[PDB]
Amino acid sequence: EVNYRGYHHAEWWVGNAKQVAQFYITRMGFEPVAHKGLETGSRFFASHVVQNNGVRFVFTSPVRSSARQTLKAAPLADQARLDEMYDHLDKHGDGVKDVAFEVDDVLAVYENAVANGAESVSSPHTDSCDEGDVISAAIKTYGDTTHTFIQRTTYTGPFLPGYRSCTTVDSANKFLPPVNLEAIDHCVGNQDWDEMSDACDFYERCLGFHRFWSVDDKDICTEFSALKNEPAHGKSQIEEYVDFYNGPGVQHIALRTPNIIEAVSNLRSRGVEFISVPDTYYENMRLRLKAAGMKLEESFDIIQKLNILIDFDEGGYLLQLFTKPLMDRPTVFIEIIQRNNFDGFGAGNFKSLFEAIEREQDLR
Amino acid sequence: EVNYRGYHHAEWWVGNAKQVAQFYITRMGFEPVAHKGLETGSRFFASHVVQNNGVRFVFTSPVRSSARQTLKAAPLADQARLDEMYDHLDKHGDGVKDVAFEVDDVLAVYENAVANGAESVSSPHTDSCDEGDVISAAIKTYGDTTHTFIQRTTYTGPFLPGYRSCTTVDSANKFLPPVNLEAIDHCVGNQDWDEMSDACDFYERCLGFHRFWSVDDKDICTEFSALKNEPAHGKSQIEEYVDFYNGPGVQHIALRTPNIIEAVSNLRSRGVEFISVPDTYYENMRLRLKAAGMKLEESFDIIQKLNILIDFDEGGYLLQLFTKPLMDRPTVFIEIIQRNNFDGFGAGNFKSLFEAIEREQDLR
Ligand SMILES: CC(=O)C1=C(O)C=C2Oc3c(C(C)=O)c(O)c(C)c(O)c3[C@@]2(C)C1=O
Ligand SMILES: CC(=O)C1=C(O)C=C2Oc3c(C(C)=O)c(O)c(C)c(O)c3[C@@]2(C)C1=O
Ligand SMILES: [Co+2]
Ligand SMILES: [Co+2]
Hints:
Two copies of one chain form a homodimer.
Chain A: E1 7-13, H1 17-28, E2 31-36, E3 45-52, E4 55-62, H2 76-91, E5 95-102, H3 106-115, E6 119-128, E7 133-140, E8 146-152, E9 164-165, E10 183-188, H4 193-204, H5 215-225, H6 241-246, E11 251-256, H7 260-270, H8 279-291, H9 300-305, E12 309-312, E13 317-322, E14 332-340, H10 347-361
Parallel strand pairs in A: 1-4, 5-8, 11-14
Antiparallel strand pairs in A: 1-5, 2-3, 2-9, 3-4, 6-7, 7-8, 10-11, 12-13, 13-14
One copy of the ligand CC(=O)C1=C(O)C=C2Oc3c(C(C)=O)c(O)c(C)c(O)c3[C@@]2(C)C1=O binds next to helix 4, helix 5 and helix 10 of chain A.
């Protein structure tokens, strides 16, 4: 019954994979699924994959230091990998690193990608455990985040080669209200203009008759190309959406739910914390929705209490919400979105939210 | 009613303070208490303090990278601090960094410490917010972990200068069975022999007529000085206590509970995971306890199910248990201990547990 929307998973690079992974277990309803580490011969990195219906996260941490003087000298390729991982956690901190797509024909989707100028990160190769085989490749897309192409061949195991399945459920979830998340809706690994642009232009040059590997990126780039804020050291009436819009190296990963009220509630009660949109947003939005005769399913007054956002067109609307920044840097957010016939991505909420500080800064 | 046993707190250095701190909120029953960061002018580090009755943890993360090229050039003292924090997370990873003691007369306890050869880390100084003042100092003790001496003067605020109080309770705890932890029982920031020794000899030279700042370290060094394992690539019948005993740079922090059964249960059900001691341990222990006429309060059979450990003497016993390593390095553990008239620290369980693999390796 589960539904990946073609996303194999998203892999994070984080300092404490083992413990950070549990954040999503306790706060957001995930379940431990697979593991890769010193128990399956991974001498240099541990990986913890937690899943929520279609949503699958991988958290990956080095298990050892750079010049680890006690046991082995690291092979040259591997010390470079460890070195790379620390330099990313320094520059960026905990965050999404790689979006990986279930793909038929990695060789082909990889080939076209670099023909049109993709920065290669991992030419096609074939990780091969005892449960089978898989072909992957990877390319730089949005900043230093990446896309990975995955073609299952003979592999049958839990997840990928090297991974072992997970030995049973998590107990904290028999006490916690569940979070009905469906699948990964989209992901922008870096929201700098230059960076976004660069990645979008690259995607456009990847368009052909064969369908592009990430429909959700093609529609984001399309919707936001039709147009390309202002802060205050007050807090800002936009609160942390101003950091979302104007912060550097900001990311967000969005997670589709069939019920954003149910989702947001059970996350409010598990202890997750979202940005507060001002009252003036709903003021103006209630008129816009009414004048346009767009009648929502959900009570407008509950969408207000929950600081949930709205965008729409003639055929339907979306419901959107953002967590407070997940870490001590204001750079990583998670979006929860519910669609009722709207392929949109929230372009309207830039105008609306920017207009929200507008009436407040114009107030003086 | 709360009881710190003279421990102001333990401060961890971790990669993701904001999220790691919540681990202890969800998995172990802590509550958010104070915060220090970009919201109180801390341009370089964030601190999250969570408390459980007497137990108070501080988690501290850099909010910025080393050569953060976007905003400020860091002052020389501060870039050194950021640089230091990354080098510790590289060499060691997430773990306890500093044990801090509520102390009258920092100047004096600091003075004697370095007279007898303490490695100074922070001469007496006086952090001074608008709610008052505090004197601190710090010295290297066990490896690169530290002790900090804290003398409240005019400070009245939540916690320390720069900290703001915490805006209300965590919701996940109205759904989770509580964990009745009392206070910090002890802490060994590095269990290498050389390192332990060095720190103990240093403590001994700190003994005088004035009482020593950490009674729990003086008794550890005393009990374990009366004596100073063997592993298998099988897993080991000792399971992860072999990593505890023979692993390098292992730490553990112990947390006293009045009811280790209640504590361990509610932690089993919140999702915390402990090492399994073999059956042969309880086999031999039931005879030892009986021959010695030591009658326990708690059902021996529940202490067996819960992989809880036992040490005792003529006047009473202790009950001990260890988590599985908390991170992808096998280097940080947490001990839960319950005392019934026994100042011991588990020296007996070395003999018992070492003897447990003994009958198993002797089995062949
Ligand atoms: C509202 C939100 O969820 C965000 C999203 O999910 C998809 C994003 O793509 C862009 C792009 C470029 C064109 O792709 C852009 O230029 C701006 C100014 C922008 O604001 C966004 C985004 C970040 C959007 O704001
Ligand atoms: C059982 C446990 O809780 C541990 C504890 O809490 C206090 C520790 O101090 C030592 C010391 C030195 C003398 O202090 C030592 O040499 C050995 C071999 C030792 O094993 C321990 C410890 C680590 C003990 O094992
Ligand atoms: Co969005
Ligand atoms: Co102990």
